[PDB]
Amino acid sequence: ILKRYVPCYTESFLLDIYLFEKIYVEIERRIENHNFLFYKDESLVQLQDA
Amino acid sequence: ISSLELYKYSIFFRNYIENVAEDCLKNGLILESAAHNVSEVELARLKVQLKNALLNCIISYRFHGIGYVLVKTKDTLIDLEQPVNIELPIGFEYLDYEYVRDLGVDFDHITYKAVKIHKSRLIIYENFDYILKRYVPCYTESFLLDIYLFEKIYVEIERRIENHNFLFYKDESLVQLQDALSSATTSLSALTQSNNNHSKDISNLRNLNDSLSQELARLKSNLNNEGMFYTATPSASLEVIKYDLSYLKEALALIKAKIGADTKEPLTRSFNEQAKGLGNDGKGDRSNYYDFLKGVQEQVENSCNLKLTKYFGLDMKFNSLIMLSEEQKVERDIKLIELYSKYNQLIQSSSFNNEELAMLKEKLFSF
Amino acid sequence: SSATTSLSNLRNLNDSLSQELARLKSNLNNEGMFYTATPSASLEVIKYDLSYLKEALALIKAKIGADTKEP
Amino acid sequence: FNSLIMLSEEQKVERDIKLIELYSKYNQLIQSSSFNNEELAMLKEKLFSF
Amino acid sequence: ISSLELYKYSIFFRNYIENVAEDCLKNGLILESAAHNVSEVELARLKVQLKNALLNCIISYRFHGIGYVLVKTKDTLIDLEQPVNIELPIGFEYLDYEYVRDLGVDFDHITYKAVKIHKSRLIIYENFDYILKRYVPCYTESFLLDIYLFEKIYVEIERRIENHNFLFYKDESLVQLQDALSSATTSLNLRNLNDSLSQELARLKSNLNNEGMFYTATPSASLEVIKYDLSYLKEALALIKAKIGADTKEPLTRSFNEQAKGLGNDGKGDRSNYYDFLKGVQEQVENSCNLKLTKYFGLDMKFNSLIMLSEEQKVERDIKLIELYSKYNQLIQSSSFNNEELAMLKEKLFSF
Amino acid sequence: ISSLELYKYSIFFRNYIENVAEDCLKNGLILESAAHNVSEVELARLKVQLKNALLNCIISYRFHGIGYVLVKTKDTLIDLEQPVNIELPIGFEYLDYEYVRDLGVDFDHITYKAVKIHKSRLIIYENFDYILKRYVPCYTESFLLDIYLFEKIYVEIERRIENHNFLFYKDESLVQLQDLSQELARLKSNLNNEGMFYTATPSASLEVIKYDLSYLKEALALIKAKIGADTKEPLTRSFNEQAKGLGNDGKGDRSNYYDFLKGVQEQVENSCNLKLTKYFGLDMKFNSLIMLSEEQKVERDIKLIELYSKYNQLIQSSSFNNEELAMLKEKLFSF
């Protein structure tokens, strides 16, 4: 049908493998700061900006 | 939706197309000569080439709607036009659909690439739909749409994988002071464009975004160091924006249901989770895939033997779809021997009339 | 939008504007943090649903099973 | 290529036992039957092992 | 991510590396001499040293991609360069990868630390990938990332264990007076304000401990418990376990030491993936050793069977075989089959 | 994280260290003399002392990475430097790691506390890692961190047990009293009396402040998973809930702990017999890890007797050729 020699895999299969790896890539990207503190204060910025 | 593009992109479509042919030629063929003069080695080589041609023939039948196998004999390239009365073929060669021009059944020749070949040398396997009055493939527009959606789900997954979770930060700091000066300057410059310190506005914008990048780097640095994000503005806000996948999950469920409804191939329906169901269960309740394969095999046998026997003196047969194991064969032999022993005992130790024994003979399957 | 309307001096204007917009967008997208300066700015995820189609598929399967005898 | 399915020693012994039992049953039937020659021959082809 | 650093820090990586070698040499080897002249005691000692060398050889093969075992003979340190025609080895010594310099297969010598050693005295176990055209270890960057995340989960757990729950207190009291004056004037006595603030905080803490009631004066005072969460780390652990199980075939590594090696006898030919992997590794090691042990040293090595039968299993198999022989004898004695038929039965029978 | 401090504080670490040695020497040893001249009583006493030394040897091997056992003979303290050709040992004594100075394998002597001892009188059990090119213990930094977190969970539990629930109260007239305070505490006692807390201020507030433990529960689950992944000792993995798995199941599918113990026993046997046979004429062996019960022995004997009876019946009532019978003999395991 394609009139050419082809491997055993296709673009969709490559995409599936790439997503399989990208999941843990993202996990590593957001593992360190999964939980953090958001603090709002005016006197403390009176200190920090100085 | 283009069938060729879908075939190139998706391996699932390729497997769906090729599985039927592979299963049909899994168990092999039996080749015989009417004259009983050809040696078995040459006939076996002919059978091997016939299987090789038939695989591509069935693949082309499923993809395009027609498949052509040329029966190569000891003749010149110009002699292909002439008909054949009786000959022993040298081999079989599958002909590409794109290089074959056929004007219909009313004609007895085709053009191959421009060599004219008589139809008596060609094995034709066609799927003609009388309702549509045309040759059609094994798939339809709805099936193509189902496959396209199946791929598009993971296309979208790749599109939104990287930024599935991110931070939305609103801050009225020194940064917003710069940004608001920038915004007012850009709005006034837009008014002037619709109609001059716009260069000053540009230099602003540039330095302002430089400072913005610096401040964002500092904020991220603080976040990484002490795990605390601090801000000055009492109206500052920080919210996590998240994506969702329930739509795609439900769509996958529906698409799997549609594919299972739209095809009979067990691997395609079950996503390679179910078996082909071509085993021996000791019962006559065969599977739908078995019935489909039997019909395809019967059609292929008819197509081949329409011209192999008439013009070439050869007969082809398909091997049995169900293959018995050695243990099953031994068990069947044991049961048959027990049946014969029981019949012999009854005959020896009975005084039935001859007519009654004969009548029992016909009503017995084995005897 | 006014620029595009006029297209459907100005060269330098559009080059500077495009440079600034592209850099701002690129920074906000790359840092994995969407920043804005407007106190009234809003960002919301809009999502679709499929329960209607799932229930419709169930009902349609029931109707087909009732309407035909072919297993 | 070697056979994909490799039988274990116990499986080989079991198969040998079953085959020996089949042969014993065939011998008993032949010795204690009075079937015609044509009928016995016809049984031979329809039997897989014989 | 550094493989050496991960090996130093994590015991899981070390176990993953060493389990395959330990399983391969669990059941032992068989050593034989072609000449049939070496005494069995000396050959057994040689086998012991060979096993000791092969363990480190396989470990180096998995970690670096190549492993070197020197076959020590009765020769001087300078004689290692000279080739060997026929000799009986004195022993086997594993060579460290970091001290071995090899220029490729086109060369027939290596440098060890600078002693030149001919390749005919060396057992080389290498993993060459033709697609990559280089020697590669048994692990990849994704696997290293998985292990790193597996450790980083508990790193984060340790980071946030101490202050998982704490109190957030807002109070416009004398304490806020003190801290506001401190803020303003430090941005610009104060140490006395410091002392008073600390004193009042300790007093309120003491009150809390004493009477189990925290009291405050300010109508706008607030007290809220701030808490952390672990669902992210739990889900990440699940995903990481799935990835590790997908990325390796070693059952202990996949199951976190929860599953067995699956190297028992089930009476069926359906062997396990770990069994197939170990058989392939053993075949490669056997080929690598016997390529030069037989040609240059007249020695042959074999691996013991991976599946070891128990005494009860042996007795059961013997009983079944004796029953089969008895049935065959009975059939032969009480049958009248033709000679050709009996012969044909003989070939189609496995045991006979 | 300090391994010594963790060992001092936590009994779990101590049990993890000592369980392997206890299991290895649970079933005992077998001691033999090549000359066949030593009486069995003296050899049994030597075996007892050898077991006592080997326990501490294995413990030191796991904790530090090397273990030393001195083979004491009939010699003076200065004669330890001299090598030994052939002698019968008087006993075995484990040597503390902290008092032993060894410069490496290139040297044939050590210093003990400063007595110089030749290496021919010492049984050395070492764990050398060729990748790291150094002696390493059986634990790593991650394992130490896991144990530390396991203890820190209950440390935090103790920190917040007393004030898990308390009252937050806001009132203005009451602080007019406070800034009297003990008298309002007495009014809280009157609350305890009458079951009703009453206040004056329309803006007075009373709220129960509560703590939570889901974080620690989830952390305990994750830590248990990590420990199970990081060690092979069944008791350590299962928190003393699973058995050692060293029984007899009638199958060759042994356990991971059995394989680990067998490897450790083989290493110990090699280390001991490298010098017991060469310099002292003694051989040591470990008892079988799997010990059969009396009923199992009787059942095995019954099965073997049945097998022999079947073989005898086949031989008596068969007419097989001599070559066929011989060929059956090799293919039979028992015969």
From TrEMBL, chain D:
- Source organism's superkingdom? Bacteria
Q: Report what the protein is called.
A: Phage portal protein
Entire-sequence positions represented here: 358 to 407 of 407
UniProtKB/TrEMBL annotation, chain F:
Q: Name one Pfam family in it.
A: Phage_portal_3
The UniProt keywords, alphabetically, are:
Coiled coil, Plasmid
Q: State the superkingdom.
A: Bacteria
Q: Give start and end of each Anti-CBASS protein Acb1-like N-terminal domain.
A: 3-309
| InterPro entries hit by this protein | Acb1-like_N, UCP020357
Q: What is this protein called?
A: Phage portal protein
Q: Which organism is it from?
A: Borreliella burgdorferi (strain ATCC 35210 / DSM 4680 / CIP 102532 / B31) (Borrelia burgdorferi)
Q: Lineage of the source organism?
A: Bacteria, Pseudomonadati, Spirochaetota, Spirochaetia, Spirochaetales
